[PDB]
Design a protein around this ligand. Structure first.
Ligand code: WMN
Length: 346
């Protein structure tokens, strides 16, 4: 097999002329020339089979992406693996080759208001499709937002996704860990398992803020610090919002804090479009029941140049319940991954 950085990257002969482009969660990512479609592609190598949790994440993404088809979600073009379960050690997922991602872009590039609006529209258009399938992405962040050379935007990585379950979302204080710290909604730390759609809207609000200033708006230094940054900008929650938190440990923690004033968005972002800040405020609302939903966000005046509900499609076949992947040993999950990837074999 061809080798990259001393590691097996066994994708031939269809995919040739390999170049290393970064790291995925269970392996490296390369670009490669697709000799059938005569275009270069991205290929991520996955090596999950020694751990049940890795197999779960891999199966999850494959099942979701083989059902999804949407312009703002990066799909699966091909899956490469050995012809037998016995020989299958790695799995390679082939996807469109993009130019960059929003994390890399925001390191050095200031966005015009027109770019911010177009990027946000595309994020919400893809998220509408995701949520219409009864799915939660649960790890939206700049490095999961890919851009091509004409600034078409696509959402990456469904390995952390879940089927929505709002009736079983309540839990205890300081126990849950959903999403990446800076993009994690306050209720994750207070009383939520991250099983409702409002978890994703919070992450999009964080991304919008970062597009406006090229800095993360809530840069917690560790898990427990994140709520400090959120409350330092939103200020103390209202009585009504606290009454919506029945869990005593969570509510009493908030009640034990000194009063904090809200910091006005236009003081944090004095050059921002005021319509953008109105939408930002609605996405970064403390109470998840009052937080704007994806279809409302698409209809907000900030996005009026793009909004077109008849061109904002929804999923044909929503996921009705979660895949019940837990308690499945890694051997059964390897079998399921093998079966789900069979459609790509010659
Ligand atoms: C999507 C997630 C990411 O893009 C991010 O996690 C990144 O750090 C992972 C490594 C690089 C991905 C990448 C890089 C370039 O230059 C072009 C691409 O198309 C991709 C890509 O498609 O990444 C997918 C596989 C993961």
């Amino acid at each position: 097999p061809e080798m990259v950085r001393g590691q097996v990257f066994d994708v031939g002969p269809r995919y040739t002329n390999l170049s290393y482009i970064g790291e995925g969660a269970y392996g490296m990512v390369c670009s490669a020339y697709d000799n059938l479609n005569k275009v270069r592609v991205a290929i991520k190598k996955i090596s999950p089979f020694e751990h049940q949790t890795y197999c779960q994440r891999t199966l999850r993404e494959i099942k979701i992406l083989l059902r999804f088809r949407h312009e703002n979600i990066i799909g699966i073009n091909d899956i490469i693996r050995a012809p037998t379960i016995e020989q299958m050690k790695d799995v390679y997922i082939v996807q469109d080759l993009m130019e960059t991602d929003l994390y890399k872009l925001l390191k050095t590039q200031h966005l015009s208001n027109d770019h911010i609006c177009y990027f946000l529209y595309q994020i919400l258009r893809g998220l509408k499709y995701i949520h219409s399938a009864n799915v939660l992405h649960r790890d939206l962040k700049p490095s999961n937002l890919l851009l091509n050379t004409t600034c078409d935007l696509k959402i990456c990585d469904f390995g952390l996704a879940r089927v929505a379950d709002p009736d079983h979302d309540h839990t205890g204080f300081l126990t849950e860990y959903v999403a990446t710290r800076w993009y994690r909604a306050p209720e994750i730390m207070l009383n939520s398992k991250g099983y409702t759609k409002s978890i994703d809207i919070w992450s999009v609000g964080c991304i919008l803020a970062e597009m406006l200033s090229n800095r993360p708006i809530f840069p917690g230094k560790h898990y427990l610090d994140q709520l400090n940054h959120i409350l330092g900008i939103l200020g103390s929650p209202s009585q009504e919002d606290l009454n919506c938190i029945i869990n005593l440990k969570a509510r009493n923690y908030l009640l034990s804090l000194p009063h904090k004033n809200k910091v006005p968005w236009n003081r944090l972002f004095p050059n921002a479009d005021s319509k953008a800040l109105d939408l930002l405020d609605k996405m970064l609302t403390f109470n998840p029941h009052k937080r704007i939903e994806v279809e409302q966000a698409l209809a907000h005046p900030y996005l009026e140049q793009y909004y077109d509900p008849s061109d904002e499609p929804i999923a044909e076949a929503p996921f009705k319940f979660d895949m019940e992947l837990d308690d499945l040993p890694k051997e059964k999950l390897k079998e399921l991954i093998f079966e789900e990837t069979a459609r790509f074999q010659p």
